[PDB]
Write a protein that binds this ligand. Sequence first.
Ligand SMILES: O=C(O)C[C@H](NC(=O)c1ncnc2[nH]ccc12)c1cccc(Cl)c1
Length: 167
Amino acid sequence: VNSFSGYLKLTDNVYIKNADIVEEAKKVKPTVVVNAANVYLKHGGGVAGALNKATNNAMQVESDDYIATNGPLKVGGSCVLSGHNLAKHCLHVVGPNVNKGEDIQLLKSAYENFNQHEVLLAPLLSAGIFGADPIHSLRVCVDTVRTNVYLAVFDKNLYDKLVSSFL
Ligand SMILES: O=C(O)C[C@H](NC(=O)c1ncnc2[nH]ccc12)c1cccc(Cl)c1
């Protein structure tokens, strides 16, 4: 038993809510919150900019030190950093950004990173300003992640569309 609340059950292990992931994180303090990152960990907008803003830019400061030491991530890859005031850990996961011309086939690889953590609060990878089809991303999530994932969908209209079309 965990302390996520009001989540619609999609499958054995995937639950979904129309909620601001930043607000969910502040309320639950999960072990792992997933950031929809880019390879440079430049947290400008979307999930990343919003999470980072909620940490008072501490996420960005930590991320810049990480990149200075390790170089960029791979598209499809991830790293574990602090969750600051939002969670124990933040799993920064790089899905493909369609508006950058990146390979949508890498979405499955991106979701595979979730399997290294027993429970996660997460956004829908490559949705929003990443420009991929959110219905497809949800299908990849359910068909790839085996651990317990709680998806927080910001856009109300998107949430309703995702629920009503889910097979
Ligand atoms: O679920 C959605 O609607 C799509 C979701 N977006 C957000 O979670 C979001 N976007 C902008 N500002 C925000 N502030 C608090 C949350 C938040 C998303 C998912 C993957 C990549 C990106 Cl880039 C965006």
